[PDB]
Amino acid sequence: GTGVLTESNKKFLPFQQFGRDIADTTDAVRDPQTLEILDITPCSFGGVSVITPGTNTSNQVAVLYQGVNCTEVNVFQTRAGCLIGAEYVNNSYECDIPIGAGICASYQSIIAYTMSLGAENSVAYSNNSIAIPTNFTISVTTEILPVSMTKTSVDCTMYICG
Amino acid sequence: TMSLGAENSVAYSNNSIAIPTNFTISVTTEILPVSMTKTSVDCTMYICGDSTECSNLLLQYGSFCTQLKRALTGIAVEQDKNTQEVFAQVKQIYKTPPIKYFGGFNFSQILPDPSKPSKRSPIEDLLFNKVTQKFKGLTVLPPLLTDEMIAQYTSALLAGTITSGWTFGAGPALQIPFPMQMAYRFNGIGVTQNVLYENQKLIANQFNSAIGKIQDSLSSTPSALGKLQDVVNHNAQALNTLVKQLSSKFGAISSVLNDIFSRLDPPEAEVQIDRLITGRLQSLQTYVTQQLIRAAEIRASANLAATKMSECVLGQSKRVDFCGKGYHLMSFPQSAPHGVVFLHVTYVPAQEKNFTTAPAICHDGKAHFPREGVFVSNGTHWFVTQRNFYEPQIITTDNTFVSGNCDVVIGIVNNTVYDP
Amino acid sequence: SALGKLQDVVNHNAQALNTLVKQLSSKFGAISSVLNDIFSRLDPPEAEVQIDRLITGRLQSLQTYVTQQLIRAAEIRASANLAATKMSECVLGQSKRVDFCGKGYHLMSFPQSAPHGVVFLHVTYVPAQEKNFTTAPAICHDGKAHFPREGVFVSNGTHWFVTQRNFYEPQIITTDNTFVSGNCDVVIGIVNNTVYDP
Amino acid sequence: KCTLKSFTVEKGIYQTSNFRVQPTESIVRFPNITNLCPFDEVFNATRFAS
Numbered sequence: 085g086t087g088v089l090t091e092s093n094k095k096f097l098p099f100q101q102f103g104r105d106i107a108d109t110t111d112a113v114r115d116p117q118t119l120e121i122l123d124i125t126p127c128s129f130g131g132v133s134v135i136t137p138g139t140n141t142s143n144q145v146a147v148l149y150q151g152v153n154c155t156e157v158n159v160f161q162t163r164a165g166c167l168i169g170a171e172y173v174n175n176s177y178e179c180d181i182p183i184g185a186g187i188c189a190s191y192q193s194i195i196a197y198t199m200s201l202g203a204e205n206s207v208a209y210s211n212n213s214i215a216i217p218t219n220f221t222i223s224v225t226t227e228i229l230p231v232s233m234t235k236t237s238v239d240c241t242m243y244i245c246g
Numbered sequence: 247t248m249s250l251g252a253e254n255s256v257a258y259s260n261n262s263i264a265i266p267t268n269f270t271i272s273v274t275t276e277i278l279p280v281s282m283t284k285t286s287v288d289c290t291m292y293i294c295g296d297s298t299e300c301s302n303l304l305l306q307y308g309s310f311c312t313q314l315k316r317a318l319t320g321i322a323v324e325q326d327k328n329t330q331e332v333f334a335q336v337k338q339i340y341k342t343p344p345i346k347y348f349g350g351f352n353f354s355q356i357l358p359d360p361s362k363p364s365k366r367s368p369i370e371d372l373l374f375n376k377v378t379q380k381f382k383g384l385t386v387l388p389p390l391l392t393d394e395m396i397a398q399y400t401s402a403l404l405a406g407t408i409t410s411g412w413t414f415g416a417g418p419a420l421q422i423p424f425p426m427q428m429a430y431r432f433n434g435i436g437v438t439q440n441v442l443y444e445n446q447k448l449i450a451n452q453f454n455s456a457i458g459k460i461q462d463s464l465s466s467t468p469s470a471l472g473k474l475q476d477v478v479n480h481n482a483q484a485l486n487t488l489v490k491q492l493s494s495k496f497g498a499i500s501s502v503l504n505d506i507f508s509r510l511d512p513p514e515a516e517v518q519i520d521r522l523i524t525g526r527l528q529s530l531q532t533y534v535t536q537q538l539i540r541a542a543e544i545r546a547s548a549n550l551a552a553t554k555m556s557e558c559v560l561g562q563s564k565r566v567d568f569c570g571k572g573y574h575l576m577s578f579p580q581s582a583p584h585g586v587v588f589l590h591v592t593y594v595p596a597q598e599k600n601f602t603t604a605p606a607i608c609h610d611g612k613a614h615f616p617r618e619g620v621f622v623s624n625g626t627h628w629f630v631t632q633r634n635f636y637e638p639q640i641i642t643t644d645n646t647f648v649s650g651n652c653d654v655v656i657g658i659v660n661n662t663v664y665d666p
Numbered sequence: 667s668a669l670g671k672l673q674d675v676v677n678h679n680a681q682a683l684n685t686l687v688k689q690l691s692s693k694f695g696a697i698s699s700v701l702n703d704i705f706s707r708l709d710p711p712e713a714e715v716q717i718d719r720l721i722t723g724r725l726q727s728l729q730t731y732v733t734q735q736l737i738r739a740a741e742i743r744a745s746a747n748l749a750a751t752k753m754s755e756c757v758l759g760q761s762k763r764v765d766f767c768g769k770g771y772h773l774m775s776f777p778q779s780a781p782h783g784v785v786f787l788h789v790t791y792v793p794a795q796e797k798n799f800t801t802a803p804a805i806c807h808d809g810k811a812h813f814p815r816e817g818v819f820v821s822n823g824t825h826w827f828v829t830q831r832n833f834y835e836p837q838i839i840t841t842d843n844t845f846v847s848g849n850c851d852v853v854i855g856i857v858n859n860t861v862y863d864p
Numbered sequence: 865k866c867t868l869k870s871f872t873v874e875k876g877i878y879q880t881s882n883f884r885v886q887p888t889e890s891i892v893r894f895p896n897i898t899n900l901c902p903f904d905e906v907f908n909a910t911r912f913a914s
C-alpha cells in the first residue's frame with residue numbers, strides 16, 4: 085500500500101493484524117518486527133480548478149486546490165481549499181466568479197473577496213407613522229423561457245454497423 | 247380495514263344558513279427541501295487508482311468520465327442556482343427597529359437572537375439541532391452560501407414582512423404600523439377591520455399561544471423533519487453503495503488490481519482488467535443517472551419553494567390551501583439544513599350558529615338585495631351581516647340595492663327596510 | 667448574455683450529438699475500431715469476440731445518450747408547462763400572484779417568439795416618491811368610531827384625510843366614505859376629529 | 865484550453881485535473897525471521913553416509 089504512516093492510538097487485540105474502516109479499507113496496521121500500531125492515511129489529494137477572467141480580457145489565472153491545507157503544496161486559505169494567485173481584500177462586492185463558502189473572485193489583477201449580501205437599508209417603523217406613495221413608474225421587464233428542444237432521430241443499424 | 251374518516255352529515259335544508267361567531271388564529275408548518283450535497287467524482291482514483299498502466303488501458307476506452315465530470319458540475323451549479331432562487335429575492339438587507347413592540351404580538355421565537363453566537367432564532371436553532379470522512383476520489387464540494395448568509399436573508403425577509411407589510415416585495419419598502427397591516431390582511435379575506443380593532447388583545451394572545459405551541463410541537467415530534475432527513479440519508483446511502491461496489495468481484499478471479507497484475511501475465515490480466523473496469527464504469531454510470539434524477543426532483547421542489555416564498559410571504563395569496571389550511575393571512579420563513587421551513591399564519595372560523603336566511607326582501611313592490619352581506623333572522627327580526635362573521639346590522643337602504651319587483655325571485659320574504 | 671437559456675439548450679444538444687458522433691472512434695479495448703480491418707485481419711473465431719465487444723460498447727454509449735436526452739426532455743417539458751401557465755395567466759388576463767408576472771404590481775404582458783422558446787414583456791406598475799404621514803386607526807366622533815371603507819386615515823400635521831392605499835389622493839372625511847362601528851372606547855389608538863356630513 | 869478543446873476560454877472557473885503527491889520511499893515490514901534450517905548438521909557433518 086501507499087500512504088502516510090503515522091502513530092496510531094488504536095489498540096489492536098494481540099491476534100489482530102489489520103485495521104479496517106467502514107469503507108472496508110486498510111487504515112491501521114501492526115508492525116511485524118516491533119509490535120506497534122500505525123495509522124495509514126492516503127497522501128494528500130485534491131482536484132485542481134483554474135479561475136480565469138476570460139482570455140479576451142487577459143491571461144492571468146489563479147489556481148485553487150480543493151480540500152488541501154496550504155502547507156501541503158499570494159496564497160490564501162479558504163474552506164474550499166488553498167487559493168493561490170489571488171489576493172484577499174477586506175472590501176466586499178457582488179459575487180462575480182463563485183468559489184465556495186461565501187468567497188468569490190474577480191478581475192480588477194485578480195482579487196478574492198467575501199461576497200456582499202446587499203445594500204443595508206433600515207426602515208423607520210413606528211406605531212403612528214405610515215408612508216404613502218405620491219407618484220408611480222410604469223416598468224417593463226422581460227422573461228425568457230425555453231419551450232422545445234431540437235427533435236432528433238437515430239438510425240441504429242447504420243450507427244452501430246453501417 | 248382502514249377507516250377513511252368520521253361520519254358527518256351537515257343539516258342542509260332549503261332556507262337555513264350557518265355563520266361563525268368566533269375565530270381561531272392557527273399556525274402551521276411546511277417543510278421543503280431546497281438542495282442536496284454537491285459532490286464531484288474523480289475518474290482515475292475511483293476506477294482503479296494509482297496504477298499508471300491501468301490509466302493507459304483506460305484512456306483508450308473513451309471520454310466517459312469526462313461526461314461524468316460535466317454532469318456532476320452541472321448538478322452542482324444547479325444546486326447553487328436553486329438556493330439563489332429560493333432565498334435571494336430581495337436586494338436590500340432590512341433591519342428591525344431596536345424597540346420590538348408590535349401592538350402586543352410577540353416575535354421573539356422567530357426573530358434573530360443576538361445572545362447566540364450564531365445569530366439565529368430559537369426555531370431555526372431547534373431545526374439545526376434536530377437534523378444530523380474517508381474518500382477515494384469522492385469529493386464533497388461546499389455550498390456557495392454558508393448558513394450565516396442564509397440566516398441573514400431570512401432575517402431580512404422577516405424584517406421586511408413585519409415592518410413594511412407586503413409593499414417591499416413590489417417596489418420600495420413603505421413602513422406601516424403592524425395592527426393596520428393585520429387589519430388590511432383581514433380586509434383581504436372578507437372580514438372588516440372593526441373585527442380586528444375590537445379584538446386586538448385576544449388576537450395577539452392567540453397568536454403568541456399558537457407560535458409557542460408550534461415551537462413545542464417541533465421540539466417534541468422527531469418525525470416532522472423527514473422531508474429533510476431523507477435527503478441526507480439518500481445521498482449518504484447512495485455514496486456508501488458506490489464505495490461498496492469498489493470491492494466487488496465483477497466476475498474476475500480477484501478484486502484487487504495489484505494482485506491481478508502481480509500473479510498473472512498480461513495475456514489474461516488484460517481481459518480481467520477489462521472486465522473489472524467495464525463493471526466499475528457501469529456502476530459509476532448508474533450512480534450518475536440516479537444523481538441526475540434526484541437533482542431533477544429536488545429542483546422541482548426548490549421551484550415550488552420559491553413560488554411559496556414569492557406568494558405566501560411577499561404578499562397574501564387567495565389560492566386555497568396553497569399556504570396552509572384555512573384562510574391565509576401571512577407566512578414567516580425559517581432556514582433549515584438543505585431546505586426551508588415556513589410558518590403559515592391562517593385564520594380559521596369557529597363556533598358556528600344556525601340562522602334562517604332569505605335571498606331578498608320585498609318592500610313597496612321592490613326587491614332589496616344585500617350589497618356586501620347576507621340576510622339572516624334570529625327568529626323574529628331580519629338583519630344583514632357579513633359572510634364570515636356574525637355582525638348583525640339593521641337593514642337599511644344604503645347597505646342594500648334595489649333591482650326589479652318582488653314577483654320574479656323565488657323565496658323572497660316580506661319585511662320593512664328602514665331609511666336613515 | 668440576456669438569452670443565456672436558449673443558447674444553453676442549443677449548445678447542450680449540439681455537444682451531446684458531437685460527443686455521440688466522436689464515440690465511434692473509440693477502440694473500447696478492442697485491437698481496432700474499424701469493421702473492415704478486423705474482418706480482413708482475423709478469422710471469425712476471434713473477430714466475433716472483437717465485434718461483440720465493439721457493438722456492446724457502441725450500444726451502451728448510444729443508450730447513455732438516449733437517457734440523457736430523456737432527462738433533458740423532461741426538464742424542458744416542465745419549463746414548457748410553466749411557460750403555458752404564464753401565457754394563460756399573465757397574457758390572457760391579469761394576475762394577483764406576486765412576482766409571478768414580473769416584479770411589482772402586474773398590469774399586462776405581451777409575448778414574443780424566439781428560437782426554441784418564448785419571450786414575455788411584463789408591463790408592471792411600480793410606486794415611487796413615498797412620503798411619510800401620521801396615521802390613526804379610527805376616528806372617534808360623538809362617541810362613535812368611524813372606520814374607512816377602503817382608504818386609510820392620514821394627517822399632514824393639522825388636518826385629517828382619508829386616502830387610498832397605493833396613491834396619495836387626500837379627501838375630506840365624510841359620512842359616506844366611513845362606516846360606523848361601536849363607540850370609541852375599545853379601539854386602541856383612536857383619535858378625535860369631526861366628520862363632515864354633506 | 866486543452867480541457868475545453870478551444871483556443872479562447874470564457875470568463876469563469878473550470879476544473880482541469882487532479883493534484884497528487886507522489887510517494888518516494890518504500891517500507892517493507894516483515895518479522896524478525898529466526899527459523900534457521902538444520903543445514904549446519906547436514907553439510908558440516910564430519911562423516912557422511914555411503
Ligand SMILES: *[C@@H]1O[C@H](CO)[C@@H](O[C@@H]2O[C@H](CO)[C@@H](O)[C@H](O)[C@H]2NC(C)=O)[C@H](O)[C@H]1NC(C)=O
Pocket residue numbers: 218219220221795
Ligand atoms: C411623477 O413622476 C414623473 C416622472 O416619473 C414626473 O414627470 C416629470 O416631471 C418633470 C417636471 O415637470 C419633467 O421635467 C419630466 O419631463 C417629467 N417626466 C416625463 C416622463 O414626462 C411627474 O412630474 C411626477 N409628478 C409628481 C406629482 O411628482
Ligand SMILES: *[C@@H]1O[C@H](CO)[C@@H](O[C@@H]2O[C@H](CO)[C@@H](O)[C@H](O)[C@H]2NC(C)=O)[C@H](O)[C@H]1NC(C)=O
Pocket residue numbers: 257600601
Ligand atoms: C342547528 O344546527 C344543527 C346542526 O348544525 C342541527 O342539528 C341537526 O339537525 C338536523 C335537522 O333538524 C337533525 O336531523 C340532526 O340530527 C341534528 N344533529 C344532531 C347531532 O342531532 C339543528 O337541528 C339546528 N337547529 C335549528 C333550530 O336550526
Ligand SMILES: *[C@@H]1O[C@H](CO)[C@@H](O[C@@H]2O[C@H](CO)[C@@H](O)[C@H](O)[C@H]2NC(C)=O)[C@H](O)[C@H]1NC(C)=O
Pocket residue numbers: 267268269448451452597
Ligand atoms: C371567542 O373565542 C375566544 C377564544 O376561543 C374566547 O376567549 C376565551 O373566553 C373564555 C371565556 O371568557 C376565557 O376563559 C378564555 O381564556 C378566552 N381565551 C383566550 C385565548 O383569551 C372568547 O370569549 C370567544 N368570544 C365569544 C363571543 O364567544
Ligand SMILES: *[C@@H]1O[C@H](CO)[C@@H](O[C@@H]2O[C@H](CO)[C@@H](O)[C@H](O)[C@H]2NC(C)=O)[C@H](O)[C@H]1NC(C)=O
Pocket residue numbers: 352353354355
Ligand atoms: C415573548 O416570548 C418570550 C419567550 O417565550 C418571553 O420571554 C419569557 O419571559 C418569561 C417572563 O419574563 C420568562 O419566564 C421566560 O423564561 C421567557 N422565555 C425565555 C425563552 O427565556 C417574553 O416574555 C414574551 N413577551 C415579550 C414582550 O417579549
Ligand SMILES: *[C@@H]1O[C@H](CO)[C@@H](O[C@@H]2O[C@H](CO)[C@@H](O)[C@H](O)[C@H]2NC(C)=O)[C@H](O)[C@H]1NC(C)=O
Pocket residue numbers: 624625626627
Ligand atoms: C332578534 O334580535 C332582535 C334585535 O337584537 C331582538 O329585538 C330586541 O331584543 C332585545 C333583547 O331581547 C329587546 O330588549 C328589545 O326590546 C327587542 N326589540 C324589539 C323591537 O322587540 C329580538 O328579540 C331577537 N329575537 C329573538 C327570538 O331572539
Ligand SMILES: *[C@@H]1O[C@H](CO)[C@@H](O[C@@H]2O[C@H](CO)[C@@H](O)[C@H](O)[C@H]2NC(C)=O)[C@H](O)[C@H]1NC(C)=O
Pocket residue numbers: 658659660
Ligand atoms: C307580502 O305582502 C304582499 C302585500 O302585502 C302580499 O301580496 C298579497 O297576497 C295576498 C295573498 O295571496 C293577495 O290576496 C293579495 O292580492 C296580494 N297583494 C299584492 C299587492 O300582491 C304577499 O302575499 C305577502 N307575502 C308574504 C310571503 O307574506
Ligand SMILES: *[C@@H]1O[C@H](CO)[C@@H](O[C@@H]2O[C@H](CO)[C@@H](O)[C@H](O)[C@H]2NC(C)=O)[C@H](O)[C@H]1NC(C)=O
Pocket residue numbers: 206207208209215796797798799
Ligand atoms: C418620514 O420620517 C421618518 C422619521 O421622521 C424618516 O425616517 C428617517 O429618515 C431619515 C432620512 O435619511 C434617515 O436618515 C433616518 O435614519 C430615518 N429614521 C430611522 C429611525 O431610521 C423617513 O425617512 C421619512 N420618510 C421619507 C420618505 O423621507
Ligand SMILES: *[C@@H]1O[C@H](CO)[C@@H](O[C@@H]2O[C@H](CO)[C@@H](O)[C@H](O)[C@H]2NC(C)=O)[C@H](O)[C@H]1NC(C)=O
Pocket residue numbers: 822823824825
Ligand atoms: C394640511 O392640509 C390642509 C388641506 O389643504 C391644509 O389646510 C389648508 O392649507 C392652505 C395652505 O396652508 C390654506 O390656504 C387653506 O386655507 C387651509 N384650509 C383649511 C380648511 O384650513 C393644511 O394647512 C395642511 N397642513 C400643513 C401643516 O401644511
Ligand SMILES: *[C@@H]1O[C@H](CO)[C@@H](O[C@@H]2O[C@H](CO)[C@@H](O)[C@H](O)[C@H]2NC(C)=O)[C@H](O)[C@H]1NC(C)=O
Pocket residue numbers: 806857858
Ligand atoms: C375626545 O373627546 C372626548 C369627549 O369629547 C374626550 O373625553 C374626555 O376626556 C377628558 C380627559 O380625560 C375627561 O376629563 C372627560 O370627562 C372626557 N369626556 C368624555 C365625554 O369622554 C377625549 O379625551 C378626547 N380625546 C383626547 C385624546 O383627548
Ligand SMILES: *[C@@H]1O[C@H](CO)[C@@H](O)[C@H](O)[C@H]1NC(C)=O
Pocket residue numbers: 210211345347349854855
Ligand atoms: C408606540 O410606540 C412607543 C415606542 O415606539 C411606545 O412607547 C408607545 O407606548 C406605543 N403606543 C402605542 C399606542 O402603541
Ligand SMILES: *[C@@H]1O[C@H](CO)[C@@H](O)[C@H](O)[C@H]1NC(C)=O
Pocket residue numbers: 259260261
Ligand atoms: C325546500 O326544500 C325542501 C326539502 O328540504 C322541500 O321539501 C320544499 O318543497 C322546498 N321548498 C320549495 C319552495 O321548493
